[PDB]
Design a protein around this ligand. Structure first.
Ligand code: HEM
Ligand SMILES: [C-]#N
Ligand SMILES: [Cl-]
Length: 118
Protein backbone atom coordinates (compact mmCIF):
# COMPACT_ATOMS: atom_id res chain seq x y z
CA UNK A 1 0.00 0.00 0.00
CA UNK A 2 1.00 3.65 -0.40
CA UNK A 3 3.73 4.87 2.03
CA UNK A 4 1.36 7.67 3.08
CA UNK A 5 -0.80 5.01 4.73
CA UNK A 6 2.16 4.27 7.09
CA UNK A 7 1.93 7.75 8.58
CA UNK A 8 -1.64 8.99 8.05
CA UNK A 9 -3.47 12.31 8.06
CA UNK A 10 -3.24 13.07 11.77
CA UNK A 11 0.45 12.24 12.30
CA UNK A 12 1.39 13.92 9.03
CA UNK A 13 -0.43 17.12 10.10
CA UNK A 14 1.47 16.96 13.47
CA UNK A 15 4.86 16.37 11.74
CA UNK A 16 4.37 19.41 9.56
CA UNK A 17 3.08 21.78 12.24
CA UNK A 18 5.89 20.83 14.50
CA UNK A 19 8.30 21.39 11.55
CA UNK A 20 7.03 24.96 10.99
CA UNK A 21 7.21 25.79 14.72
CA UNK A 22 10.96 24.98 14.37
CA UNK A 23 11.37 26.84 11.07
CA UNK A 24 9.74 29.87 12.81
CA UNK A 25 12.41 29.74 15.54
CA UNK A 26 15.28 29.09 13.11
CA UNK A 27 17.16 32.41 12.53
CA UNK A 28 18.41 31.41 9.04
CA UNK A 29 14.93 30.32 7.75
CA UNK A 30 12.31 32.49 9.53
CA UNK A 31 13.31 35.60 7.38
CA UNK A 32 12.70 33.95 3.97
CA UNK A 33 9.41 32.34 4.94
CA UNK A 34 6.15 34.18 5.49
CA UNK A 35 5.68 35.73 8.94
CA UNK A 36 2.40 33.78 9.17
CA UNK A 37 3.10 30.13 8.25
CA UNK A 38 -0.59 29.04 8.47
CA UNK A 39 -0.92 28.63 4.65
CA UNK A 40 2.57 27.15 4.02
CA UNK A 41 1.88 24.34 6.50
CA UNK A 42 -1.53 23.67 4.84
CA UNK A 43 0.18 23.35 1.45
CA UNK A 44 3.06 21.16 2.74
CA UNK A 45 0.48 18.72 4.16
CA UNK A 46 -1.22 18.47 0.81
CA UNK A 47 2.19 18.22 -0.82
CA UNK A 48 3.60 15.62 1.56
CA UNK A 49 0.41 13.55 1.14
CA UNK A 50 1.05 13.42 -2.63
CA UNK A 51 4.80 12.83 -2.13
CA UNK A 52 4.07 9.75 -0.02
CA UNK A 53 1.85 8.19 -2.74
CA UNK A 54 -1.42 9.32 -1.18
CA UNK A 55 -3.99 11.40 -3.08
CA UNK A 56 -2.49 14.22 -5.19
CA UNK A 57 -3.95 16.92 -2.91
CA UNK A 58 -1.34 19.45 -3.98
CA UNK A 59 -1.72 19.26 -7.80
CA UNK A 60 -5.48 19.08 -7.30
CA UNK A 61 -5.35 22.56 -5.68
CA UNK A 62 -2.25 24.51 -6.72
CA UNK A 63 -1.25 22.77 -9.89
CA UNK A 64 1.76 20.84 -11.03
CA UNK A 65 4.34 21.06 -8.25
CA UNK A 66 7.68 21.62 -10.05
CA UNK A 67 9.21 22.43 -6.67
CA UNK A 68 12.60 23.56 -7.89
CA UNK A 69 10.80 26.22 -9.95
CA UNK A 70 8.54 27.26 -7.10
CA UNK A 71 11.63 27.67 -4.91
CA UNK A 72 13.81 29.58 -7.44
CA UNK A 73 12.73 33.10 -6.29
CA UNK A 74 14.24 32.34 -2.87
CA UNK A 75 17.95 32.19 -1.89
CA UNK A 76 18.23 28.47 -1.16
CA UNK A 77 21.82 27.81 -0.07
CA UNK A 78 23.37 24.48 0.85
CA UNK A 79 23.43 25.78 4.40
CA UNK A 80 19.69 26.69 4.25
CA UNK A 81 18.83 23.26 2.76
CA UNK A 82 20.67 21.85 5.73
CA UNK A 83 18.78 23.99 8.31
CA UNK A 84 15.41 22.87 6.76
CA UNK A 85 16.61 19.23 6.99
CA UNK A 86 17.78 19.73 10.56
CA UNK A 87 14.41 21.26 11.44
CA UNK A 88 12.69 18.28 9.83
CA UNK A 89 14.82 15.72 11.62
CA UNK A 90 13.99 17.40 14.90
CA UNK A 91 10.25 17.44 14.02
CA UNK A 92 10.35 13.70 13.36
CA UNK A 93 12.07 13.06 16.72
CA UNK A 94 9.29 15.04 18.43
CA UNK A 95 6.37 13.07 16.98
CA UNK A 96 8.38 9.92 17.49
CA UNK A 97 8.54 9.05 13.79
CA UNK A 98 10.80 5.97 13.40
CA UNK A 99 11.44 2.91 11.28
CA UNK A 100 11.18 2.37 7.55
CA UNK A 101 8.65 5.08 6.88
CA UNK A 102 11.02 7.58 8.59
CA UNK A 103 13.90 6.25 6.49
CA UNK A 104 11.93 6.48 3.26
CA UNK A 105 10.47 9.95 3.81
CA UNK A 106 13.64 11.55 5.13
CA UNK A 107 15.89 9.91 2.58
CA UNK A 108 13.69 11.30 -0.18
CA UNK A 109 13.54 14.75 1.52
CA UNK A 110 17.31 14.87 1.66
CA UNK A 111 17.48 14.29 -2.11
CA UNK A 112 14.74 16.86 -2.76
CA UNK A 113 16.12 19.66 -0.59
CA UNK A 114 19.51 19.39 -2.29
CA UNK A 115 17.74 19.55 -5.68
CA UNK A 116 16.20 22.88 -4.37
CA UNK A 117 19.64 24.48 -3.94
CA UNK A 118 19.93 27.36 -6.46
C1 HEM B 1 16.03 23.79 0.92
C2 HEM B 1 15.32 24.22 1.96
C3 HEM B 1 13.99 24.91 1.64
C4 HEM B 1 13.69 26.20 1.82
C5 HEM B 1 14.59 27.33 2.40
C6 HEM B 1 12.33 26.40 1.36
C7 HEM B 1 11.68 27.59 1.39
C8 HEM B 1 10.38 27.79 1.04
C9 HEM B 1 9.70 29.06 1.06
C10 HEM B 1 10.33 30.42 1.48
C11 HEM B 1 8.43 28.86 0.67
C12 HEM B 1 7.35 29.97 0.55
C13 HEM B 1 6.12 29.67 1.42
C14 HEM B 1 4.82 29.69 0.62
O1 HEM B 1 4.81 30.14 -0.57
O2 HEM B 1 3.76 29.24 1.18
C15 HEM B 1 8.28 27.45 0.38
C16 HEM B 1 7.14 26.80 -0.02
C17 HEM B 1 6.97 25.43 -0.23
N1 HEM B 1 7.92 24.42 -0.06
FE1 HEM B 1 9.97 24.76 0.38
N2 HEM B 1 11.84 25.17 0.93
C18 HEM B 1 12.85 24.24 1.08
C19 HEM B 1 12.78 22.88 0.80
C20 HEM B 1 11.60 22.19 0.55
C21 HEM B 1 11.42 20.75 0.50
C22 HEM B 1 12.51 19.67 0.75
C23 HEM B 1 10.13 20.52 0.17
C24 HEM B 1 9.53 19.12 0.00
C25 HEM B 1 8.84 18.54 0.99
C26 HEM B 1 9.44 21.77 0.02
C27 HEM B 1 8.11 21.95 -0.32
C28 HEM B 1 7.41 23.15 -0.40
C29 HEM B 1 6.02 23.30 -0.79
C30 HEM B 1 5.02 22.20 -1.23
C31 HEM B 1 5.74 24.80 -0.66
C32 HEM B 1 4.45 25.57 -0.97
C33 HEM B 1 4.56 26.01 -2.42
C34 HEM B 1 3.36 26.80 -2.77
O3 HEM B 1 3.33 27.96 -2.29
O4 HEM B 1 2.44 26.29 -3.50
N3 HEM B 1 10.38 22.77 0.26
N4 HEM B 1 9.48 26.81 0.64
C1 LIG C 1 9.19 24.52 2.12
N1 LIG C 1 8.79 24.40 3.21
CL1 LIG D 1 11.23 19.31 -9.56
Amino acid sequence: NAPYEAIGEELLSQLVDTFYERVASHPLLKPIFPSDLTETARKQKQFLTQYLGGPPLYTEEHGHPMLRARHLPFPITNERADAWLSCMKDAMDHVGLEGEIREFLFGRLELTARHMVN
